[PDB]
Amino acid sequence: GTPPPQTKTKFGPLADEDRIFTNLYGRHDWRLKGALKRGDWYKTKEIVLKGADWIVNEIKTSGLRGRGGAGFPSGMKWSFMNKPGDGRPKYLVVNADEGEPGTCKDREIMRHDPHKLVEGCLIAGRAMGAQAAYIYIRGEFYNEASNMQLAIAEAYQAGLIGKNACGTGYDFDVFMHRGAGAYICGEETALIESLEGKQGKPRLKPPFPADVGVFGCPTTVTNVETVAVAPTICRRGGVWFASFGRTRNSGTKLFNISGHVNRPCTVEEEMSIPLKELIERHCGGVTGGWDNLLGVIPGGSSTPIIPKNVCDDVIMDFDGLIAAQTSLGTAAIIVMDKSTDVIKAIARLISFYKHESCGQCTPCREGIGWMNKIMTRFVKGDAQPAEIDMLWEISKQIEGHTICALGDGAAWPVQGLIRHFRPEIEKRMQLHAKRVSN
Amino acid sequence: DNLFVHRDTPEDNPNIPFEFTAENKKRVEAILSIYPEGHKRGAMIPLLDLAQRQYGWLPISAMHKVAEILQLPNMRVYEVATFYTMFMRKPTGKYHIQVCTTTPCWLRGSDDILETCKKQLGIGVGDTTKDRKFTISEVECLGACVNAPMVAINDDYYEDLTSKDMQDILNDLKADKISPPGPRNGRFASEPKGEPTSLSEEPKGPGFGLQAGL
Amino acid sequence: DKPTVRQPDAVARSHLSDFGRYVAECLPKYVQKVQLTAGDELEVLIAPEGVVPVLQFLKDHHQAQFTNLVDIAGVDVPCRKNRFEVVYNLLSLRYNSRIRVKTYTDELTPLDSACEVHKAANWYEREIWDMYGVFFANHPDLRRILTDYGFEGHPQRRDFPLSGYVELRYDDEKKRVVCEPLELAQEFRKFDLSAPWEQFPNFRN
Amino acid sequence: SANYYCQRDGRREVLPPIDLVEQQKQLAASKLPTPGKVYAWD
Amino acid sequence: SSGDPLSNMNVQFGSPEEAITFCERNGWRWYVDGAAKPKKERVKNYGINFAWNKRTRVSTK
Amino acid sequence: YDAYNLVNFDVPIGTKGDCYDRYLCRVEEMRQSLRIIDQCLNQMPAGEIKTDDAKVAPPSRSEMKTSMEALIHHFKLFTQGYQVPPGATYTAIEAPKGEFGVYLISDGSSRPYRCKIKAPGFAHLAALEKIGKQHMLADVVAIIGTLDVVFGEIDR
Amino acid sequence: PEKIEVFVDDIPVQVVPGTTVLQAAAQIGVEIPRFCYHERLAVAGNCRMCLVEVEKSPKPVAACAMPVMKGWRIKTNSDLTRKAREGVMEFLLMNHPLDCPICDQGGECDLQDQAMAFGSDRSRFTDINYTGKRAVEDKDIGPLVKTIMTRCIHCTRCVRFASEIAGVDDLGTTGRGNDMQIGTYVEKLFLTELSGNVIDLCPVGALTNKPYSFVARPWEIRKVSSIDVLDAVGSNIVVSTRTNEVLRILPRENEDVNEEWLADKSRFACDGLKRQRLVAPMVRMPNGELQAVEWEGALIAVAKAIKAAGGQIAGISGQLADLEAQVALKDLLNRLGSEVVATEQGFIAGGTDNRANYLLNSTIAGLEEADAVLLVGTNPRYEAPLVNTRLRKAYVHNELQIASIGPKIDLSYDHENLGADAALVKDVCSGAHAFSKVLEGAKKPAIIIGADLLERADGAAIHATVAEYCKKLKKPNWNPFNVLQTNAAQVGALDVGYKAGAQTAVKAQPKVLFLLNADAGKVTREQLPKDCFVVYIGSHGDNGASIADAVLPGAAYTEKQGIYVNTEGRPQQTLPGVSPPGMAREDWKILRALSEVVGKPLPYDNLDELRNRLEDVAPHLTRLGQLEPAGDAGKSIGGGAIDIKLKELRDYFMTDAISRASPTMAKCISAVNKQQRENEAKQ
Amino acid sequence: RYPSGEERCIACKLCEAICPAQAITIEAEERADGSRRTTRYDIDMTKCIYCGFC
Amino acid sequence: SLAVEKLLNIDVPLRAKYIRTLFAEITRILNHIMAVGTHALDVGALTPFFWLFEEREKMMEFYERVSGARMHAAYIRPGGVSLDMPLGLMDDIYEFASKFAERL
């Protein structure tokens, strides 16, 4: 462990030599001949033959955190599975749904740099003891599914993965699984139960995926982004990846900014960047200027909202954002200006959580539909002000009382909307009361 | 409109058969070789999709054939195919236009796109056009949001939709002509427009910044 | 505040606590356990052999002038080794308070009568003789007071049935009101109103 | 909005009766005690 | 209609020894239908539902 | 008890203890009851009529037809009733014949374990043996009236 | 191993480390509320009622499936625990329909009691006025169940019961989210010999007993403990009697015998006590018709026929007879000079003297610990279904591998059929077959033999062969010999001393014959001579009563107190919950009154003196609920093929006379045949 | 009865459960149209106290 | 009701308290009119029996107005009262209490 401290005051733009996804935009070849020229699949045999403990210690020195929204460090997850297992095979499982709205980054990673994903699968399988890599994909994701299947087949004909992985005598067969369109299948235990052929239906946490996972075997579910930045960590050292961002927030993150933006786009940036500099440098600024900005959602629908006064002096890492009461999560920025009514957007997001709730456990089965009814009344104006704090308690009866964090990820934006825009809801219901009173 | 309880219909019933193609049977035995023996139930997630790649939609004979192949009861395949919304248990058109409605696409005017679709094709969401050519059924998030508004017609992501662009899309599709997918503003997918602010120069390549002792 | 929840009296709690400790200090032989129930009422559980002096103490002490004995209540608990319990409720007008003195009695064990202390018990223990069947020794007049003259058994004992054992009708070949075995025209439909889920977690200890 | 039953449940706030000698023994390790205020009915 | 006066009386007790001594006190012809039920230690945890080469792997959910 | 300390009245006291003093005391309680009736007609607040514990008080018919938990609480209050916590109490009031006391002891179930009713006329009919002795037969008839004693509460 | 200390409700307790929070809570005495945790089913986290707050944790934990560790302080009566319970079940109750006065589970519904305890007082659901609560369609799951799917709370108990214990996977979870419905996807029938327990396992009562449709209420019910007699398991039941009528049969928990589970035949035959009953004594007058007469005239007519018999008297015991009527019948026949008695179901010759030849010597509670069993011509799914539940539990948990001999049967689990020839029954006893090596290598082996092979003569020698293999399979505190009976009177009659051959009384050729609750139809009038006088003592009019020259009405198993002995040998006595109808009386009272009218009375005039006479017979029949361990069990194999009488559900439904009289089993058979004919019409 | 003509009682036996002198006797079964109805609703008017709990 | 409310540790509202107090003193007048009429019949005065039972029948009419039964009201319950008083009971009770002083 023990990642190095940063000791840097201001975090500027990421240099192009520091950008990992060099073919993110798609100006070079996605195939293996372009990827070998771009720096992928280089000295993989040495890193694989150097041992699992060296790769786990390099990840722990690098300070890599989870990119899927949990925020749990990947070094601890990869060191949970270094314990010996008797009679049971070991599995690495890659999550690639991202049904959180605002998120498009790892779709571009799979469609444009798939050999980074395959090399990271081999590196994590060597570091973890896994003998097979399972990659889940959306049913809506088909063109990049065929792209990743063709890249996996090209890696099989190259001999980089397979029975003999780069001449190291390691058996690692990489399979890719096509899953139907479901946001709940992005949860790790639900993706296990989808890989086992059942419904979504997420498992309880008192069994852990390192203990009981896919096919009853020890497994570990990791994101596309963590796996894709793993071989760049292994090749360029953990101190280089720890030289970006603050302590306990180290690394580079692939931010995508959409919404009321002149140029909605995805860029790879150093962590603890200012949000205003992030929009104004890469994305061309908020439409109507910075004074026209109403709110930003920093990480998609799992995270609450940020108003303008908090937005003017906020940083993009985990720790400063959770000091500002909102998780970073998936790091997908949605920008809404002053011409956008916010209640329709939050009602749409609560309806999205109602549609993508699996329906197993009670509070997310029922209270999310309750919140969809209450925000439908809030959009229309039929409610009273005394509903509002009651709606807060509905969130307080869901957050922490569910199997997933989908209940937490639905209780959070209602809490953020109430805490930042309660007088706007009061003005909306006063306008509706004055409308119906005549 | 969507029902989770099946009733007997002339459109879908166990009396109508559904047999796999020999090439599709080779695909069946190639799919079943991935999963370990004794845990082949995990094969039913692509296999039903394979039925959706053969019939165009999912009847109950496909469910019975999957349960016969995997040696499972029919009700497990029923609850798996009922849980997922990608499997259409109702008959659908040839070109399945699925639009987006969730607010990272609604800030860019996806309601205008849905209004244009309902105006031209004459039916609401979840309905089928009478010649079985088009079907509007809104799905919730397409997994890519910076190119909003975004629809999918038969698994191709049509991005950056001005209403005139979707007018051109329907005018091309009604004459059974292929249309170029992706964004329609001349923008290659997921990049800033005009001047590239990132990834402008060439990459360094292998051997750049190698770790010592490797 | 809490408008639904009943607010107790703190000064009455302190006064009854001090008086209960005073009673437990004054009579270490007969007083068995002094408790203070919810609702600010003091219960002095005593030995049976201290049935007559303790009440006399509560009649005659300067800080215990419980001049009125309002009623004596008997509770039949068949699960205990000594079955019946006898509750003396006393009212003090000088200090404006009430006390309960509880004792235990078998089906055959006597109780010494409190008629030398309080004369109201001159009928009250008679009711406890009729309803339960405990003998009160040194009673000036011990007879059945509430039941029939030819009645057999004691009614409010829990071993006795609700509808009794016998019925009465009028008979013309004897020209008399006669006694017959009990047959209801419609039986007493017993309702099972036992709670299957416990509600109070503070009373299982 | 504001109310929960846990702050309004009078049936669960009762307790078993307190043994006063035991309470004094636990908490300990002038005028004489009266049952109440003196009322003159004379 | 019923001619049985004792058919409606259930008397609560803590232990069967107390009820046996009460019936010997009142002279009833007593018998005990069944003794106290012993408790069997059954292990229940969530990991048995998802198992490897075991027949206890659940098919629901 | 039950808001007697927000209303004001007078307590009539006899002197001799005969029938005439008790008759004048009853007429004075009648007039002071008219005074308390005057004060209670003078002031009453606007509000609810019952407590809002729906596990204790039955719910109204509007929340019967609309809400679900009120229907559950109605069903379990009119089949098995509320659960009284186990314990003993004695509450005594001033009935017009005397102190009316209830000694209620409960085992925690749906039914009371034992309820004892203190008859106000029980002690009066007990001391009838000393009070009515050495008197006329007509004097015994008046004495039985002076003690107020309907025998439903005495006989229980 | 070691015991870890956990402080539940600030009370220290030592627990096994595999136990969860709720098991430690039930160990110290506190009952944590639940809707989906059943201790005979798999654990699940979908009702979320059992949330408790443990110390130094950010979120409450589900007590049913979170295993404890050393140093935990669990607070059951905490404020956060009560707030979580109130919020979760407020979410449970936002969409429940207002159906409590038309719901048969009300008065004993879990949701009503858990709203009165650990629930809120008022509904926070404002939206009842506009865009109100959901409603889903009803699915025709079966004719035994009544399904109102609006009341379902998605607790997934029925689906786990189907896929774990019932065996078939017809039930499932369709839909996603708030529109999730717990039912079959198509109009199917869920059929198992165990569907009635689904009504037991539904906590809210979306699934309801359809024979018990709006009949009574649970606070009104007089609950009387009894033992069902239709199956040979001898399952402990409780009978619902209200105002002198039977209402329904419900399970009573005996861990050794049934363990909260009841068959459909044992449960849904409460209608059979109402139909085809016998209420008057009937005598066949010489004009050719059976006419109802008085009791005294019928008794003196049977006495005159007995005096006209003059030494040729025989008696046959049936399947619904208790121990006491069989003892009284044998005492009457032995006092009259007749040494022949009969039982309807046959048995081997010479197996009466030792109990182990006709006893399920391995305990029903011990059969869940078996490692490999062998079925010799039996179908325990229909003959004795709770034994099949024990075998399913041992198949799921103890990895039991099972081989069967006979035709192809479905045992609700995976099994291998060796064949239908009896000669391979020798081969498993010979050691040449591989399953003989499986049974020899197993830690706790067993061999289960159906009684219908012991009805055969040459297969009796098969019995002896299996006994020889038990001498190669003896284990400490484990008897591998097992005989699975069909009726509940055979083991009791063999304990008394009956000759179990039904052809024995026919071969004796009597002049007056006694049929004691016999409705099997094994005896006819063409086998008996023309001067025979068949006397029927049982309660139901059937083929046994159709051939009787004198019909005496008896009481059913819910109308009399009588000892029944099951397959394992546990003698248990029923209780008279309901008075007998008409002039019907108890059967041993009929036999004692017949002994009074004839002239040689039985020495007992009371039931306790009859129990003393049973003590004089055998001391193990006097003690009730206590099973003594039996001793060890003690050869030309015929070429006949092994056959099972009960191979399908429609044969299982009409096994017994009470099941024959009820219209519920006829409705079940009509529904099963209708579903099969619609399947054949569609295919 | 209802304004449609159907009798209002649905045989839920709340009134007999709350009838404190046990005057009401209710026996019920499923009616031929499937509705939950009574087949016996007796009130002992000599056991009634006219209390309005029903 | 005070016994059950002390056992249940619940509190009645102020309006239910005033209704209980008002009807307790109305009930007191009824008991005293009963005592005065009974003592007048026992002594021998036939007339104030009827002269005060006219007012006593007015109060049982008030009881029938508030609860529905003339004598056995079943009105005061654990946890307040069963029903609110109907409108216009104030004027009737006030007119009766104005005339009852002259009747006494």
Ligand SMILES: Cc1cc2nc3c(=O)[nH]c(=O)nc-3n(C[C@H](O)[C@H](O)[C@H](O)COP(=O)(O)O)c2cc1C
């Ligand atoms: C309802 C829900 C949906 C999620 N969906 C995704 C997803 O599609 N992709 C993803 O990478 N993580 C998703 N997550 C986060 C998961 O915890 C996932 O295991 C994550 O990859 C863990 O972080 P890490 O593996 O990068 O350390 C989701 C979480 C929840 C609660």
Ligand code: SF4
């Ligand atoms: S939180 Fe929602 S999505 Fe997760 S298990 Fe519960 S019902 Fe399913």
Ligand code: SF4
């Ligand atoms: S399920 Fe329970 S709470 Fe719901 S209607 Fe039936 S009895 Fe009432």
Ligand code: SF4
């Ligand atoms: S039908 Fe009953 S047992 Fe099945 S899930 Fe619903 S509530 Fe549970």
Ligand code: SF4
């Ligand atoms: S009359 Fe009685 S049984 Fe009928 S609906 Fe009313 S309360 Fe229920």
Ligand code: SF4
């Ligand atoms: S009014 Fe009559 S029938 Fe109704 S509950 Fe009261 S006593 Fe029973």
Ligand code: FES
């Ligand atoms: S919100 Fe439209 S694709 Fe994500």
Ligand code: FES
């Ligand atoms: S009992 Fe634990 S979640 Fe259901």
